[PDB]
Amino acid sequence: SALPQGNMKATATSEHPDVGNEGLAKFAIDGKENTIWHTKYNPVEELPQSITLELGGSYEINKFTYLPRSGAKNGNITKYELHVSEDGNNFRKISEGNWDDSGSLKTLKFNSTKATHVKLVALEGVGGFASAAELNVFA
Ligand SMILES: OC[C@H]1O[C@@H](O)[C@H](O)[C@@H](O)[C@H]1O
Ligand SMILES: [Ca+2]
Ligand code: NA
Ligand code: NA
């Protein structure tokens, strides 16, 4: 089941300031589909950029979901890696691939692994931005 988002802390390598529904990292874990993390723009901080969720404990995780922004496409992530850490500093890759640029929920299912942190790396995204409406981590 999804770990409680209110026990997590989101940080990112790049985040746009709060201009309403974007683009602070914490907007990716607020349970609100209208608010999004978005990489910093004006000017762009180029991809790759990433968002890390500190989980609020060390959990055996097996699924991750990425919900894109709704009603528009800038930052819809189309090439990704998923990494995990048990110390907040040293990361290891557990998933990688391509996603379509539609607003559909994107789900990753993987070998059970122990993590205190999960990092979603946007290698490519629509417009060269990365964005995320909601991220969930399942244990
Ligand atoms: O310049 C980048 C910006 O483009 C806007 O059109 C969009 O609504 C923002 O979310 C951001 O992607
Ligand atoms: Ca949100
Ligand atoms: Na343990
Ligand atoms: Na394997």
Numbering used by the authors: 1355 to 1493
Publication text:
The 1.55 Å resolution structure of the CBM binding galactose revealed the β-sandwich fold with structural metal ion, in this case modeled as a Ca2+, which is common to the family. The galactose residue was well-ordered in the crystal structure providing clear electron density. The site accommodating this carbohydrate is a shallow cleft marked by two solvent exposed aromatic side chains, F1483 and Y1395, which is present in the loops at the edges of the β-sandwich. The C6-OH group of galactose fits into a corner of the binding site made up by F1483 and Y1395, whose aromatic rings are at nearly right angles to one another. A series of hydrogen bonds involve the side chains of four amino acids in the carbohydrate-binding site. With the exception of E1376, which makes hydrogen bonds with the C3 hydroxyl group of galactose, all of the interactions are highly conserved with other known galactose binding CBMs. Indeed, the interactions made by the five residues H1392, Y1395, R1423, N1428, and F1483 make up the canonical galactose-binding motif in the family 32 CBMs. The CBM displayed little to no preference for either galactose or GalNAc and did not appear to significantly favor common disaccharide motifs that terminate in galactose or GalNAc over the monosaccharides. Though CpGH89 has at least one functional CBM its specificity (i.e. galactose and GalNAc) is clearly mismatched with the specificity of the catalytic module.
CpGH89 (EC 3.2.1.50, CPF_0859), also referred to as AgnC, is a family 89 α-N-acetyl-d-glucosaminidase that has been shown to specifically release terminal α-linked GlcNAc from the disaccharide GlcNAc-α-1,4-Gal and demonstrated to liberate GlcNAc from crude class III porcine gastric mucin. Overall, the enzyme comprises a glycoside hydrolase family 89 (GH89) catalytic module, four FIVAR (found in various molecular architectures) modules, an unknown module, a C-terminal fibronectin type III-like (FN3-like) module, and six putative carbohydrate-binding modules (CBMs). CBMs are presently classified into over 60 amino acid sequenced based families; the CBMs from CpGH89 all belong to CBM family 32, which is one of the most diverse CBM families. Thus, CpGH89 possesses a complex multimodular architecture where the composite modules function together to efficiently act on components of mucin.
